[PDB]
Amino acid sequence: AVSEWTEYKTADGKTLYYNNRTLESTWEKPQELK
């Protein structure tokens, strides 16, 4: 969806936003992606 974070979701319970910022993986939803 967004160019920054990789939207990485599975019904297995995976909420991952991997982005090359620092390689900052946001498992808490950032304000930069809904």
XYZ file of N, CA, C and O in Angstrom:
136
model
N 0.841 -1.216 0.000
C 0.000 0.000 0.000
C 0.867 1.253 0.000
O 0.741 2.102 -0.880
N 1.753 1.354 0.984
C 2.637 2.504 1.111
C 4.028 2.144 0.586
O 4.353 0.965 0.452
N 4.836 3.148 0.276
C 6.161 2.908 -0.280
C 7.186 2.673 0.827
O 8.215 2.027 0.611
N 6.906 3.209 2.008
C 7.835 3.119 3.124
C 7.862 1.713 3.718
O 8.811 0.959 3.516
N 6.795 1.351 4.411
C 6.771 0.138 5.214
C 6.276 -1.032 4.373
O 5.414 -0.856 3.514
N 6.796 -2.225 4.625
C 6.300 -3.399 3.959
C 5.171 -3.966 4.793
O 5.364 -4.239 5.989
N 4.014 -4.161 4.152
C 2.812 -4.588 4.843
C 2.798 -6.093 4.851
O 2.649 -6.751 3.816
N 2.987 -6.625 6.030
C 3.394 -7.989 6.183
C 2.472 -8.640 7.205
O 2.700 -8.557 8.410
N 1.377 -9.204 6.712
C 0.293 -9.644 7.576
C -0.153 -11.068 7.232
O -0.352 -11.385 6.056
N -0.335 -11.921 8.241
C -0.890 -13.246 8.030
C -1.891 -13.551 9.137
O -1.759 -13.041 10.254
N -2.900 -14.363 8.825
C -3.914 -14.756 9.805
C -3.307 -15.563 10.955
O -3.993 -15.909 11.916
N -2.015 -15.850 10.845
C -1.269 -16.533 11.898
C -0.975 -15.569 13.050
O -0.421 -15.950 14.081
N -1.382 -14.320 12.874
C -1.109 -13.301 13.862
C 0.203 -12.607 13.595
O 1.120 -12.640 14.414
N 0.297 -11.989 12.428
C 1.501 -11.282 12.035
C 1.154 -9.868 11.588
O 0.467 -9.680 10.584
N 1.590 -8.887 12.357
C 1.433 -7.490 11.986
C 2.801 -6.830 11.915
O 3.314 -6.324 12.910
N 3.399 -6.877 10.741
C 4.763 -6.423 10.558
C 4.848 -5.354 9.489
O 4.316 -5.512 8.391
N 5.499 -4.259 9.832
C 5.850 -3.251 8.862
C 7.357 -3.068 8.840
O 7.929 -2.359 9.670
N 7.999 -3.776 7.926
C 9.453 -3.689 7.768
C 9.825 -2.584 6.777
O 9.388 -2.593 5.628
N 10.614 -1.621 7.247
C 11.019 -0.471 6.435
C 12.488 -0.141 6.667
O 13.014 -0.322 7.765
N 13.117 0.409 5.641
C 14.564 0.476 5.538
C 15.091 1.702 6.257
O 16.284 1.990 6.201
N 14.168 2.415 6.911
C 14.513 3.517 7.835
C 15.848 3.270 8.539
O 16.868 3.876 8.210
N 15.816 2.388 9.514
C 17.016 1.845 10.134
C 17.005 0.334 9.932
O 17.919 -0.380 10.344
N 15.939 -0.101 9.249
C 15.423 -1.468 9.282
C 14.525 -1.584 10.491
O 14.617 -2.515 11.290
N 13.638 -0.611 10.590
C 12.757 -0.479 11.722
C 11.486 -1.256 11.448
O 10.717 -0.912 10.550
N 11.316 -2.334 12.177
C 10.150 -3.169 12.033
C 9.082 -2.741 13.028
O 9.250 -2.885 14.241
N 8.003 -2.178 12.514
C 6.920 -1.710 13.357
C 5.824 -2.762 13.470
O 5.123 -3.060 12.505
N 5.721 -3.353 14.650
C 4.695 -4.349 14.929
C 3.560 -3.674 15.677
O 2.535 -4.274 16.006
N 3.782 -2.392 15.919
C 2.755 -1.467 16.348
C 2.471 -0.542 15.176
O 3.407 0.000 14.589
N 1.205 -0.369 14.819
C 0.855 0.416 13.636
C 1.354 1.852 13.749
O 0.954 2.590 14.655
N 2.234 2.260 12.826
C 2.757 3.625 12.777
C 1.745 4.597 12.177
O 0.837 4.192 11.454
N 1.930 5.880 12.439
C 1.012 6.903 11.952
C 1.185 7.107 10.443
O 0.390 7.788 9.793
N 2.228 6.502 9.893
C 2.547 6.647 8.479
C 1.796 5.623 7.631
O 1.880 5.646 6.403
N 1.065 4.724 8.279
C 0.298 3.713 7.559
C -0.940 3.306 8.351
O -0.845 2.932 9.517
N -2.094 3.370 7.701
C -3.360 3.073 8.352
C -3.608 1.566 8.405
O -4.006 0.990 7.373
